[PDB]
Design a protein around this ligand. Structure first.
Ligand SMILES: CCCCCCCC/C=C\CCCCCCCC(=O)OC[C@H](COP(=O)(O)OCC[N+](C)(C)C)OC(=O)CCCCCCC/C=C\CCCCCCCC
Ligand SMILES: CCCCCCCC/C=C\CCCCCCCC(=O)OC[C@H](COP(=O)(O)OCC[N+](C)(C)C)OC(=O)CCCCCCC/C=C\CCCCCCCC
Ligand SMILES: CC(C)CCC[C@@H](C)[C@H]1CC[C@H]2[C@@H]3CC=C4C[C@@H](OC(=O)CCC(=O)O)CC[C@]4(C)[C@H]3CC[C@]12C
Ligand SMILES: CC(C)CCC[C@@H](C)[C@H]1CC[C@H]2[C@@H]3CC=C4C[C@@H](OC(=O)CCC(=O)O)CC[C@]4(C)[C@H]3CC[C@]12C
Ligand SMILES: CC(C)CCC[C@@H](C)[C@H]1CC[C@H]2[C@@H]3CC=C4C[C@@H](OC(=O)CCC(=O)O)CC[C@]4(C)[C@H]3CC[C@]12C
Ligand SMILES: CCCCCCCCCCCCCCCCCCOC[C@@H](O)COP(=O)(O)OCC[N+](C)(C)C
Ligand SMILES: CCCCCCCCCCCCCCCCCCOC[C@@H](O)COP(=O)(O)OCC[N+](C)(C)C
Ligand SMILES: CCCCCCCCCCCCCCCCCCOC[C@@H](O)COP(=O)(O)OCC[N+](C)(C)C
Ligand SMILES: CCCCCCCCCCCCCCCCCCOC[C@@H](O)COP(=O)(O)OCC[N+](C)(C)C
Ligand SMILES: CCCCCCCCCCCCCCCCCCOC[C@@H](O)COP(=O)(O)OCC[N+](C)(C)C
Ligand SMILES: CCCCCCCCCCCCCCCCCCOC[C@@H](O)COP(=O)(O)OCC[N+](C)(C)C
Ligand SMILES: CC(C)CCC[C@@H](C)[C@H]1CC[C@H]2[C@@H]3CC=C4C[C@@H](O)CC[C@]4(C)[C@H]3CC[C@]12C
Ligand SMILES: CCCCCCCCCCCCC/C=C/[C@@H](O)[C@H](COP(=O)(O)O)NC(C)=O
Ligand SMILES: *[C@@H]1O[C@H](CO)[C@@H](O)[C@H](O)[C@H]1NC(C)=O
Lengths: 120, 1261, 173
């Protein structure tokens, strides 16, 4: 298991901006080319892994139409925080958010799970 | 009287309280005997059966008035408590307190606690514990907590003088309990570290261990001054090394041809991976670092197409450097402790130039040796004094009757027991006959012999067991050894085979006929008690340290493996398991901490490893390992063989006489005046002098013949004719000396024999050459013996002579120990062969030296099949293996000198069977063999040698009359005077000048504060020089310059102030003159260096000139008395060290000449490279200096060992050289290296120690 | 290992003579591929004419009659990494007197890097009718005997000077 710290639950007031913290303490240094971060979302608990944020030496946003342009990245991974920021949270944004880490040279593949809840 | 025991009833509490009140209204040491813990004196005799284990009244009068209650166990152990109720809850009458005392003192309590501790330890050694282990942890904590509660009951809670918290061990237990409680409710590595510690204090209490612990504690307390001296010296040396080698280890080889528009800067900004760097810099195959290079001509060279540049990281992860002061101090500590000092030496020289061997030389001798042995000295003296004080204060049936009788009658210790030992010798000779490529027939032959021999010995055992009653049998302390072994053997017969080599140890019974060996054996025996207690404390220490390391660095070692290993697999030395941790702590105690620490730091991080390793190292090596020698040194400070000999005198004489009887029944004034003439001459100092010069010149001629002689042709010719002249000279000397002295006198002197022989070899060689009888095998061999010409110099100088005598005077005594040591090593070697013979072969890929996966080449058949389909495969065997009892001894030597041991240990712990491919750690636990062997070999044996030699020296001295055996006649007068210095009385006070002003200046310079100030300023100047680093900005450089200018101005100021008042009296004090010299030197330095930087062009000389500033820093020794005393001791030891140094140089010179002749042109592999070879005189002597400290000797040896293909090629061209082939001679190589390391040990190591010990004492006295 | 040693500079008419040209690699362990061009100008002539080229174990000679059938290879055999480039003249002729250039072309193979090294050597030889001993040998030989005779004089001279003293002492006693 990798040292990934994510809040399993986070509650946010509808219409507001929310930050989704994904932080790792993987011992090996971050090489931009080796390092991979992929961000997905689940409408229902066991729905499809709706990827929305790739990483290829830079922030690659799938730019989802359920997430038109309120999604931007909220960290500096070479300081080991990879959180993601959502502007103007809305109730379909309710669901599962997941951060998956890869830290070459390190072999192990990490996983973060955050369930975002939306207030009213 | 005897029955003074009486029960403390409230009434005696009230009578104690009334007395205290009386004392108060009115307003002494106690019986060391009746002290708590101590046994009841027999004066009181037995206790009434109801008074034992009960609150009784205080015996000792001192306390009879104060409030207390004593309790005694069924072992008469006195326990004193506090009568005051703890927190006034329950009293010394409350049944609960009685129950407490009872259960606390029962033997059960303490047995349970220590049991608990031991099983807790077994659970800590668990890298991965199961789930029931939480339950057992609960159990443990509960037991300990309960014990703590019981302790707090009897003694109370911080109530009076005698309470739970008052004892610090109890405080520790309480602290441990609190931490455990705290962790569970709501750090963890630290908490468990605190847990293990309990063992240290709870097990040191057992009998025997306590004395060793006290000697250990006293050693640490007495090592204070020595440690301060070490720090100071190391600091000064680091400041010197930083100046000379700042930035030098960043020199690399950079491509001259580059892809277009790629400057070094851009290149560096992009390169991150190892392969990226290999593409731009030059790296040797199988190297994680780049090749160091230099800008001079004695420095390392760079390939063509690559140029040298100072850029990048330093070697070994960035940890070997002299860039800052901290790093320099680490390097200097490494050079003092001689840990991979060879690597540092080599790298440093490749980047700075071979001409810095002087800097390394100085440090190793005057620094490292003197400090290490001074540490030994203090520890030794501590142990000795402790031991001294300790001694001071201490001061059916009839059938049995028939059988037994008969059997005893037929055995005769006189003969039966002797032939048995002769046979033991026979059988160990047979155990030495086992090798690797042995035939099946040979195996069977030796096997039958093993049967025969154990049958012989077992019949004997049973015979004796029957004869002498089995009771008295077992009583004997040799019979039980015998029985054990015979039983083992028969079991095995009906991993044990290796324990029959111990039967050999029975031969030490017959030592009781050779007086000296007998005495040595006894000394040893006396010693073994404390030897064992010390072993115990060492094991405890290692255990605890290993556990701590596993707890703190183990997880890190697992998670960050890729950083320290390219394959991302745990390195052979790690700390993720208990066993591997034990091993690393053991390696530190043997003295190899820098490699493992590099790795630790690279994963754990630098601060934690530094402290761990440092603490670990300090206690184990510097203290405990020195107690080994201290104990042995203090130790140094019936015979039926003869019965049988008498029987033999009876027999051989009687029988021969009877046979003789049977045979008888059957049947020149002039010439004398001439001897006196040539006597005058051969004694005149002029003759002597001339001859010394000739011997010196002859030796330089030997050195001139290198592999480059043929470039230098004039010199070659000169030298041939010169050798002819020299031979004439020496023959003429010989003849004169035969007419002066006389054949008799001549051939009785041994120096003369030596000279005769050298002249003779040279004459033979000359005859041959001039006769055309040259170009033959003996003639060439004789040409190599020219290297002994250097010896004549030995006889002329007195110092070399004194040292050589002392050594000759010990040879008698070194031999005995050698016999004892040889037997021990033989045992171990036979064992080794049995376990590891033939199992060191692998199938490597020669392109890159990599044992094939072993899933793809299981045995040998398959290696060979792969060699059919592909090339670059070989069934390679280790060069120094355990394949016969001869190579075994060499392997062992390497293991015991700790140079080359790892290569062997690895292959051992990887062994599968005879023709099968080694597998990674298949036999991981083979390290135990080496642990035990390592231990004995390096700790007992070598220390035994040292002890014996030093004892011999002290005896040699005693017989002369206390006269130093390492000093010459003139050197002795100087010694006497220098000693007078340390005992000089204070001189007359300097008269105060009477010009008001000078009177004032005088008052100032004479005040103690004036000097304290000067000392603090010197201390600040040292800090100014320590903040200098590689890469400091011009701003920093400028600032530091002006600070130093101000320091110079101030010191010049105090000097002229002194000169005003003291006037001429200023130069009547030695320290004041040193200060003057330093002042001038400093100014000169500043000015000159400023010029070289501007007008001239010499960066090298800038540095060397600026080494002057450290003179101001050396003025510190005056202020510190502890430091200056040791320095004075070193000053007295200097003349003796000089002679030893001269002898070492002679021997080293001879060895270098021999190497140039034989080891040149060998394959450049392992230790032999382009800059450390035996091709020239210079290169040769560098290597030999290294090996004087037994460092890297194994590496040099490996190239020499291989004499056959494909390892070496006989026909190598060697263009520009007549010699053909790169093959080396194995027989010559082993002798050349082994002899040197032994000589070194007996000269430099053993002599240095003796001198230090002798003078340390003198100075302190 | 490799030691760069200079050619002699004097052949004997009618005999054989070897021209030495040695060029070690700075680092022995390096990997290389080498070949040679030898140019020669006769004494009293000013232009350098190539005579031979040696590459991959094959010796090419030019057509010049001064060298047809009377030069052979004494360099490094079967290696393609030469480090020793010498010429054996069989049956020396006065014609071979002059200046020789030993051009060495070296190609070093590195990790991902290749260097084209070139180095040139100069050898000036003169053909004579008889081999004559070097100045050094002759001088060293005469200085050797004088030292023997000087020393031997110093000994025996010292011997009698003190022998007379011994005689005087004996007479006085
Ligand atoms: C007595 C019994 C107790 C003895 C134990 C106490 C001894 C030492 C205490 C530990 C000292 C703690 C200081 C380390 C903390 C630290 O973080 O230090 C930082 C500096 C600079 O680090 P850097 O990143 O520039 O290093 C470059 C390495 N690269 C390139 C891979 C990143 O490192 C450095 O100067 C290394 C510090 C200098 C090494 C200490 C020398 C003392 C050794 C033996 C004492 C003899 C007695
Ligand atoms: C790398 C760093 C580069 C910096 C090097 C700078 C240092 C270079 C040279 C300075 C050392 C020269 C020593 C000069 C002072 C020694 C001396 O002239 O003093 C003699 C002392 C005894 O003097 P006193 O006061 O006991 O007796 C009565 C007073 N009286 C005898 C003087 C009349 O004799 C003795 O210890 C013998 C002196 C032992 C000094 C060895 C110093 C080597 C370091
Ligand atoms: C304790 C001190 C006095 C050392 C003396 C011990 C001897 C009893 C041992 C040590 C070295 C041993 C020898 C070392 C190696 C030789 C040759 C060896 O033969 C081989 O090495 C075979 C090699 C091959 O087949 O290629 C067989 C054992 C033998 C005779 C050993 C016989 C017994 C010796 C003399
Ligand atoms: C050349 C080889 C093949 C044979 C000779 C070897 C030498 C090393 C031997 C031959 C005679 C030996 C000597 C014979 C007699 C003596 C006396 C002996 O010592 C004494 O008699 C003690 C005198 C004293 O009490 O001072 C040991 C040394 C010495 C010089 C020996 C030293 C070693 C010598 C020169
Ligand atoms: C004076 C010294 C020799 C006293 C101490 C001797 C021990 C260190 C020796 C005695 C028998 C040895 C054992 C004999 C047999 C084997 C098999 C051998 O090969 C294996 O397969 C080892 C497997 C493993 O332990 O991992 C090496 C380990 C071991 C346990 C040996 C380990 C070291 C032992 C315990
Ligand atoms: C020895 O060397 C000189 C001898 O020849 C001298 O001894 P002679 O035997 O010749 O001496 C003659 C014998 N008397 C005269 C001494 C007895
Ligand atoms: C070979 O040369 C011998 C020289 O060493 C001679 O030196 P001397 O020892 O003779 O010097 C004079 C000493 N005597 C002969 C006067 C006593
Ligand atoms: C060839 C020449 C060999 C010479 C012959 C030697 C064999 C002669 C060997 O005989 C030994 C003794 O007679 C010599 O006596 P001393 O040397 O002890 O007497 C001392 C007197 N001097 C030394 C002062 C004169
Ligand atoms: C104290 C006594 C003094 C000892 C001094 C001895 C060392 C004196 C100098 O040491 C140089 C030798 O070790 C090597 O000789 P070379 O100068 O031929 O080194 C090779 C250089 N080339 C030929 C490649 C350019
Ligand atoms: C106690 C006695 C200790 C003696 C220690 C050695 C004494 C001194 C004799 O050791 C010779 C070294 O100095 C080596 O000389 P180099 O290698 O610096 O030679 C110059 C560099 N080239 C010429 C090879 C390029
Ligand atoms: C003072 C201490 C004395 C040191 C004693 C060292 C003696 C050890 C020497 C035994 C050295 C004898 O070992 C022989 C091995 O070299 C194997 O034999 P080779 O055939 O390879 O050797 C010939 C190579 N062609
Ligand atoms: C930690 C490992 C090495 C276990 C160490 C235990 C062994 C080696 C030690 C511990 C205590 C020691 C013993 C304590 C004292 C004595 C009494 C003496 O008259 C004979 C030796 C003898 C009997 C010692 C032999 C060795 C010994 C038994
Ligand atoms: C008369 C000629 C013989 C000389 C002495 C006799 C041989 C006896 C050898 C005694 C010492 C052998 C022990 C070996 C130790 C070193 O070689 C090692 C050095 O170990 P160290 O460098 O201290 O770790
Ligand atoms: C994106 O992340 C997912 C994590 O589930 C991983 O399986 C996938 O391979 C990643 N894609 C890339 C291109 O790294």
């Amino acid at each position: 298991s990798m040292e990934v710290t994510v809040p399993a639950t986070l509650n946010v007031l509808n219409g507001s901006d929310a930050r989704l913290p994904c932080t790792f303490n993987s011992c090996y240094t971050v090489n931009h080319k080796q390092f991979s971060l992929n961000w997905t979302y689940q409408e229902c608990n066991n729905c499809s892994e709706e990827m929305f944020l790739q990483f290829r030496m830079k922030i690659i946003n799938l730019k989802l139409e359920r997430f038109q342009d309120r999604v931007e990245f909220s960290g500096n991974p070479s300081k080991y925080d990879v959180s993601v920021m959502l502007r103007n949270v809305q109730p379909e944004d309710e669901g599962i958010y997941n951060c998956y880490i890869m830290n070459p040279p390190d072999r192990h593949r990490g996983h973060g799970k955050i369930h975002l809840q939306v207030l009213m | 009287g005897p029955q003074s025991f009486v029960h403390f009833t409230k009434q005696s509490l009230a009578l104690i309280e009334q007395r205290i009140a009386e004392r108060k209204s009115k307003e002494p040491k106690p019986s060391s005997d009746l002290e708590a813990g101590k046994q009841l004196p027999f004066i009181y005799g037995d206790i009434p059966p109801g008074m034992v284990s009960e609150p009784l009244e205080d015996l000792d009068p001192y306390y009879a008035d104060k409030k207390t209650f004593i309790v005694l166990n069924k072992g008469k152990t006195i326990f004193r408590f506090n009568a005051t109720p703890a927190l006034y809850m329950l009293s010394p009458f409350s049944p609960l307190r009685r129950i407490s005392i009872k259960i606390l003192v029962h033997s059960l309590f303490s047995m349970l606690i220590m049991c608990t501790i031991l099983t807790n330890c077994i659970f800590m050694t668990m890298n991965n514990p199961p789930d029931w282990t939480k339950n057992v942890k609960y159990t443990f904590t509960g037991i300990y907590t309960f014990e703590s509660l019981v302790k707090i009951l009897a003694r109370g809670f911080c109530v009076g003088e005698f309470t739970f918290l008052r004892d610090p061990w109890n405080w520790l237990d309480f602290v441990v309990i609190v931490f455990a409680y705290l962790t569970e409710f709501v750090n963890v590595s630290a908490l468990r570290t605190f847990r293990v510690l309990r063992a240290l204090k709870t097990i040191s209490v057992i009998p025997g261990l306590k004395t060793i612990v006290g000697a250990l504690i006293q050693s640490v307390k007495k090592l204070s001054d020595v440690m301060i001296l070490t720090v100071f010296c190391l600091s000064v040396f680091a400041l010197i090394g930083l100046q000379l080698f700042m930035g030098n280890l960043k020199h690399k080889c950079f491509r001259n041809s580059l892809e277009n528009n790629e400057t070094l800067e851009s290149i560096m900004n992009t390169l991150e991976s190892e392969e990226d760097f290999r593409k731009y810099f030059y790296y040797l195959e199988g190297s994680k670092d780049a090749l160091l290079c230099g800008f001079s001509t004695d420095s390392g060279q760079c390939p063509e197409g690559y140029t040298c540049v100072k850029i990048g990281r330093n070697p070994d992860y960035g940890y070997t450097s002299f860039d800052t002061f901290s790093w320099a101090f680490l390097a200097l500590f490494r050079l003092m402790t001689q840990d991979y000092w060879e690597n540092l030496y080599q790298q440093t020289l490749r980047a700075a130039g071979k001409t810095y061997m002087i800097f390394f030389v100085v440090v190793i001798f005057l620094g490292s040796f003197y400090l290490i042995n001074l540490i030994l000295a203090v520890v030794a003296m501590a142990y000795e004094e402790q031991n001294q004080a300790n001694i001071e204060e201490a001061k059916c049936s009839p059938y049995w009757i028939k059988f037994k009788k008969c059997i005893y009658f037929i055995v005769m210790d006189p003969f039966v027991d002797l032939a048995i030992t002769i046979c033991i010798v026979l059988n160990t000779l047979f155990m030495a006959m086992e090798h690797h490529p042995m035939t099946e027939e040979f195996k069977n032959v030796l096997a039958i012999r093993n049967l025969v021999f154990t049958g012989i010995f077992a019949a004997e055992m049973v015979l004796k067991l029957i004869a002498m009653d089995p009771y008295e049998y077992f009583q004997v302390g040799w019979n039980i050894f015998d029985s054990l072994i015979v039983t083992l053997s028969l079991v095995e017969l009906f991993g044990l085979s290796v324990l029959r080599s111990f039967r050999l140890l029975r031969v030490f019974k017959l030592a009781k006929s050779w007086p000296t060996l007998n005495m040595l054996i006894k000394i040893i025996g006396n010693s073994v008690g404390a030897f064992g207690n010390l072993m115990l404390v060492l094991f405890i220490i290692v255990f605890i340290f290993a556990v701590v390391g596993m707890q703190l660095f183990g997880k890190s070692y697992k998670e960050c493996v890729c950083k320290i290993n390219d394959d991302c697999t745990l390195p052979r030395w790690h700390m993720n398991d208990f066993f591997h941790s034990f091993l690393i702590v053991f390696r530190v105690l043997c003295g190899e901490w820098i490699e493992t620490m590099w790795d630790c730091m690279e994963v754990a991080g630098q601060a934690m490893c530094l402290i761990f390793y440092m603490m670990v190292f300090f206690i184990g090596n510097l203290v405990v390992l020195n107690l080994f020698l201290a104990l042995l040194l203090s130790s140094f400070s019936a015979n039926n063989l003869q019965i049988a000999v008498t029987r033999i005198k009876k027999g051989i004489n009687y029988v021969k006489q009877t046979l003789r009887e049977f045979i008888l029944k059957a049947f020149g004034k002039i010439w004398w005046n001439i001897r006196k003439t040539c006597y005058k001459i051969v004694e005149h100092s002029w003759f002597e002098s001339f001859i010394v010069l000739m011997i010196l010149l002859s030796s330089g001629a030997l050195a001139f013949e290198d592999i480059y002689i043929e470039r230098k042709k004039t010199i070659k010719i000169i030298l041939e004719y010169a050798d002819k002249i020299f031979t004439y000279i020496f023959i003429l000397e010989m003849l004169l000396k035969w007419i002066a002295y006389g054949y008799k006198t001549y051939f009785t002197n041994a120096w003369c024999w030596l000279d005769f022989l050298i002249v003779d070899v040279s004459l033979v060689t000359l005859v041959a050459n001039t006769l055309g009888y040259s170009d033959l095998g003996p003639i060439k061999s004789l040409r190599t013996l020219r290297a002994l010409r250097p010896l004549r110099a030995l006889s002329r100088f007195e110092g070399m002579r004194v040292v050589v005598n002392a050594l000759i005077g010990a040879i008698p005594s070194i031999m005995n120990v050698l016999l004892v040591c040889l037997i021990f090593w033989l045992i171990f070697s036979i064992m080794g062969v049995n376990l590891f013979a033939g199992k060191f072969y692998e199938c490597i890929n020669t392109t890159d030296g990599s044992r094939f996966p072993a899933s793809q080449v299981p045995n040998r058949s398959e290696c060979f099949a792969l060699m059919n389909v592909s090339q670059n495969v070989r069934w390679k065997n280790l060069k120094v293996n355990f394949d016969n009892v001869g190579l075994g001894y060499l392997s062992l030597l390497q293991v015991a000198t700790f140079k080359g041991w790892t290569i062997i240990m690895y292959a051992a712990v990887d062994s599968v069977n005879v023709d099968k491919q080694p597998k990674y750690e298949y036999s991981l636990y083979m390290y135990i063999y080496f642990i035990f062997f390592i231990i004995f070999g390096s700790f007992f044996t070598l220390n035994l040698f040292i002890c014996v030699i030093i004892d011999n020296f002290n005896q040699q001295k005693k017989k002369l009359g206390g006269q130093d055996i390492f000093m010459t006649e003139e050197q002795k007068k100087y010694y006497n005077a220098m000693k007078k210095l340390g005992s000089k009385k204070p001189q007359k006070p300097i008269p105060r000048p009477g010009n008001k002003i000078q009177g004032c200046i005088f008052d100032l310079v004479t005040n103690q504060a004036f000097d304290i100030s000067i000392m603090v300023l010197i201390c600040l100047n040292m800090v100014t020089m320590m903040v200098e680093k590689e890469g400091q900005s011009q701003h920093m450089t400028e600032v530091l310059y002006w600070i130093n200018v101000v320091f110079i101005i101030l010191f010049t100021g105090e000097c002229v102030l002194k000169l005003i008042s003291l006037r001429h009296y200023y130069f009547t004090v030695g320290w004041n003159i040193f200060d003057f010299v330093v002042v001038i030197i400093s100014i000169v330095g500043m000015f000159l260096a400023d010029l070289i930087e501007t007008y001239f062009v010499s960066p090298t000389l800038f540095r060397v000139i600026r080494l002057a500033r450290i003179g101001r820093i050396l003025r510190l020794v005056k202020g510190a008395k502890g430091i200056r005393t040791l320095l004075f001791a070193l000053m007295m030891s200097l003349p003796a060290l000089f002679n030893i140094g001269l002898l070492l140089f002679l021997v080293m010179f001879i060895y270098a000449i021999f190497g140039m002749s034989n080891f040149a042109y060998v394959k450049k592999e392992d230790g032999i490279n382009d800059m450390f070879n035996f091709e020239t005189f210079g290169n040769s002597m560098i290597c030999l200096f290294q090996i004087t400290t037994s460092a890297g000797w194994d590496g040099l040896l490996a190239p020499i060992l291989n004499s056959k293909p494909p390892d070496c090629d006989p026909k190598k061209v060697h263009p520009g050289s007549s010699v053909e082939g790169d093959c080396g001679n194995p027989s010559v190589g082993i002798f050349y290296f082994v002899s040197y390391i032994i000589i070194s040990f007996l000269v430099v190591v053993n002599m240095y120690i003796a001198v230090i010990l002798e003078n340390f004492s003198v100075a302190t006295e | 290992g490799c030691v760069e040693v200079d050619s002699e500079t004097e052949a004997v008419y009618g005999m054989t003579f070897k021209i030495l040209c040695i060029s070690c690699k700075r680092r022995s362990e390096t990997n290389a591929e080498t070949f040679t061009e030898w140019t020669f100008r006769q004494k009293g002539t000013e232009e350098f004419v190539k005579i031979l080229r040696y590459e991959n174990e094959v010796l090419q000679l030019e057509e010049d009659e001064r060298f047809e059938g009377r030069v052979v290879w004494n360099g490094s055999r079967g290696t393609k990494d030469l480090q020793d480039l010498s010429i054996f003249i069989t049956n020396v002729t006065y014609n071979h007197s002059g200046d020789y250039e030993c051009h060495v072309y070296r190609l070093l193979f590195f990790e991902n890097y290749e260097h084209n090294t070139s180095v040139v050597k100069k050898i000036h030889i003169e053909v004579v009718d008889k081999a004559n001993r070097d100045m050094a040998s002759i001088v060293s030989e005469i200085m050797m005997y004088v030292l023997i005779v000087v020393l031997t004089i110093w000994l025996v001279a010292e011997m009698i000077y003190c022998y007379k003293k011994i005689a005087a002492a004996t007479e006085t006693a």
